Design a protein around this ligand. Structure first.
Ligand SMILES: Nc1nc2c(ncn2[C@@H]2O[C@@H]3COP(=O)(O)O[C@H]4[C@@H](O)[C@H](n5cnc6c(=O)[nH]c(N)nc65)O[C@@H]4COP(=O)(O)O[C@H]3[C@H]2O)c(=O)[nH]1
Ligand SMILES: Nc1nc2c(ncn2[C@@H]2O[C@@H]3COP(=O)(O)O[C@H]4[C@@H](O)[C@H](n5cnc6c(=O)[nH]c(N)nc65)O[C@@H]4COP(=O)(O)O[C@H]3[C@H]2O)c(=O)[nH]1
Lengths: 139, 141
């Protein structure tokens, strides 16, 4: 997979110098690169969501207007959903549609496999704020 | 799971050669040593290179902990004896999320321990050199 900074440069969203500044800043915080670029004023939140979706080849969703399957939600117990920042929003056959705010999180991906074994997975990316509101709404 | 396995990553990015990888895989068997450390022992890879490519493999950043922002109030959430055992330092807290620097974020045995030790906090992981972690323990406890 292409790295996010390189993607944003190739797409003309940030310059090489801006990317280097953010990478240097990140070495001193450990915050995510996209979040760092937003702090520096070089990237917007909407761009971050859209370009993450492009990097990972996942759809963006507006959960605030989505119609969530309320019988799919409980397949992932609340304690795990909140911890992993993941919400099961649909079930077709044995494929679950799962919204995540950090779908690039390797350890969350590993955990989800452990918590929801034997299902097919389709992922969509949502803003963390919408996920958090979703947990309150659907549990 | 699934990360790209480390050998293939290092070969594809032109860090180690195919024959060297095969040599290290052969040599690693039943030594108790992981692949990166085997490659380093054979002189094909450096500690810094291993750090940087583990970070790429695990999709996390390397930090310079000697200069990094550390919430010195967040540090004590993990008692010193556990921080030292697990080679893990809590450097940020916000809501129920902790940012944790580890020398080995691939250490799942340590991760399990960290999880049971800091329950009801979720984690964001970053990697730092072990020397910097230990200096951090001396500095923040
Ligand atoms: N939800 C969310 N996801 C985000 C954000 N920023 C980055 N990501 C996604 O999450 C992964 C980890 O980001 P990171 O912690 O900044 O960790 C990054 C970062 O430290 C660094 N990195 C990212 N892009 C570049 C680059 O163009 N050049 C270099 N040298 N390093 C890069 O390598 C690590 C892995 O990069 P990736 O493969 O791109 O993988 C990224 C990316 O897929 C964010 O603000 N929010
Ligand atoms: N802190 C630290 N972490 C390390 C080091 N070396 C590897 N790791 C990480 O820890 C996991 C286990 O390494 P392993 O015991 O060598 O066990 C490895 C190794 O025996 C083997 N492996 C790795 N790469 C290759 C490869 O390219 N070809 C083959 N045939 N086997 C491979 O598969 C197992 C799993 O590989 P991975 O998915 O890459 O998962 C690796 C990797 O993420 C190290 O020196 N220090």
């Amino acid at each position: 997979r292409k790295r996010l900074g390189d993607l944003l440069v190739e797409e003309g969203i940030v310059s090489e110098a801006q990317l280097e500044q953010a990478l240097n800043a990140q070495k001193n915080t450990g915050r995510r690169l996209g979040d760092t670029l937003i702090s520096l004023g070089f990237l917007s939140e909407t761009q971050l969501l859209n370009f993450l979706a492009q990097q990972l080849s996942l759809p963006v969703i507006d959960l605030s207007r989505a119609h969530v399957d309320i019988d799919a939600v409980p397949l992932l117990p609340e304690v795990h959903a909140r911890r992993l920042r993941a919400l099961v929003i649909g079930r077709s056959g044995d494929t679950l549609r799962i919204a995540m705010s950090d779908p690039a999180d390797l350890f969350a991906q590993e955990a989800l496999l452990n918590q929801l074994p034997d299902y097919g997975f389709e992922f969509v990316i949502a803003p963390e704020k919408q996920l958090v509101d979703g947990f309150d709404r659907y549990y």
